[PDB]
Amino acid sequence: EAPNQALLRILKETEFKKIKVLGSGAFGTVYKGLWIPEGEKVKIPVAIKELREATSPKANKEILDEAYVMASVDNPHVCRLLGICLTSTVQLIMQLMPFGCLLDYVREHKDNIGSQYLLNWCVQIAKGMNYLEDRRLVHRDLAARNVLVKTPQHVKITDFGLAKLLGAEEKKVPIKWMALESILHRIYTHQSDVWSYGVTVWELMTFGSKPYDGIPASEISSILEKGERLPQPPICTIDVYMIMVKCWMIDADSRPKFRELIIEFSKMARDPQRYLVIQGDERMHLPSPTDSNFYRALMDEEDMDDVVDADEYLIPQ
Numbered sequence: 001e002a003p004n005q006a007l008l009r010i011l012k013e014t015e016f017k018k019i020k021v022l023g024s025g026a027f028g029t030v031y032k033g034l035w036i037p038e039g040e041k042v043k044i045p046v047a048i049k050e051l052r053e054a055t056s057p058k059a060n061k062e063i064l065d066e067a068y069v070m071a072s073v074d075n076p077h078v079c080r081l082l083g084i085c086l087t088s089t090v091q092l093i094m095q096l097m098p099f100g101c102l103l104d105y106v107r108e109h110k111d112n113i114g115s116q117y118l119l120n121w122c123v124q125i126a127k128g129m130n131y132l133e134d135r136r137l138v139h140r141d142l143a144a145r146n147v148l149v150k151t152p153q154h155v156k157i158t159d160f161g162l163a164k165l166l167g168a169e170e171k172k173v174p175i176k177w178m179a180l181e182s183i184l185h186r187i188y189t190h191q192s193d194v195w196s197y198g199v200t201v202w203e204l205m206t207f208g209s210k211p212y213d214g215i216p217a218s219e220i221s222s223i224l225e226k227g228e229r230l231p232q233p234p235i236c237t238i239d240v241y242m243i244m245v246k247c248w249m250i251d252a253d254s255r256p257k258f259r260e261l262i263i264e265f266s267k268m269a270r271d272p273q274r275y276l277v278i279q280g281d282e283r284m285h286l287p288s289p290t291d292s293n294f295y296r297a298l299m300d301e302e303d304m305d306d307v308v309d310a311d312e313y314l315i316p317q
């Protein structure tokens, strides 16, 4: 295979300050924060994923795998890794996605989310996945909770901790998002991801409902073998639902390519009303502020005159 000449950047902990906890897990905490590169004179809104514990070697090995992958990708719909910090525990410094989970987002704003937005998120997510396929990368954990929202206009994929190379046979499980071939055979492929992509498209079409809700995960393998699938969402045209259903074929080669899913949804986003029926589609506004005022309250700090988003902070430094 090709040599991987990604640069891994090492940051001083002095260069950045934590501001708020975004998420607390066992063995990890995620901070909203600010980062000032050294001698740069720019301020960069970051999220900082840190391990509370000392190893936890398996946990420690999993965070460095995640940094390895994230450092090795460059795409507008994949999340950037800015660098790592070699403190008592290892920290990942990544671009901050100010609007959070796409999952959280759809539930919080379901009454103000129009068809153009849904169709385009579908297009972008596919594009990210297609980029990962291009790089021979299998995500193995696509879901709406792992898609982050930079602006309402711009989502990016994330959570590469489980990400493996194709055919790697590398050393909880979501289950509901998992292809049948993955549940029975621990087989994972880009077309395995295509399945998870379908379940994600479903999660968005229902504004965040739980797949196979009230069904125990142990049951699911039998359900999918019988021929049962997720129901057709209300807002959902047969055309869109028919796309989901093809992602959920038994024969993974018959499932659509991410290459194709970009094209299909892209066409639908040209006439978004014809493929998704949303009550009051017109008087729907989703607000993205780009003002220097906007960043505060968050990281209220004081003066954000020198903010640069990660996407505008490029290197060779």
Ligand SMILES: */C=C\C(=O)Nc1cc(Nc2ncc(Cl)c(Nc3ccccc3S(=O)(=O)C(C)C)n2)c(OC)cc1N1CCN(CC)CC1
Residues within 6 Å of the ligand: 022, 023, 030, 032, 047, 048, 049, 094, 095, 096, 097, 098, 099, 100, 101, 102, 103, 104, 145, 146, 148, 158, 159
């Ligand atoms: C639905 C959970 C979520 O994503 N909440 C969230 C996310 C962000 N933005 C953001 N930007 C960059 C990163 Cl790396 C993360 N990571 C992150 C944040 C929170 C939980 C988990 C992760 S992670 O996927 O494990 C990463 C690989 C470490 N997040 C955000 O920016 C403001 C705010 C939120 N939330 C958290 C939940 N909160 C209500 C309790 C609403 C806003």
Ligand SMILES: [Cl-]
Residues within 6 Å of the ligand: 014, 015, 016, 017, 036
């Ligand atoms: Cl500082």
Ligand SMILES: [Cl-]
Residues within 6 Å of the ligand: 023, 024, 025, 028, 029, 030
């Ligand atoms: Cl966490």
Ligand SMILES: [Cl-]
Residues within 6 Å of the ligand: 036, 037, 038, 039, 040, 041
């Ligand atoms: Cl500096």
Ligand SMILES: [Cl-]
Residues within 6 Å of the ligand: 080, 081, 082, 310, 311, 313, 314
């Ligand atoms: Cl970058």
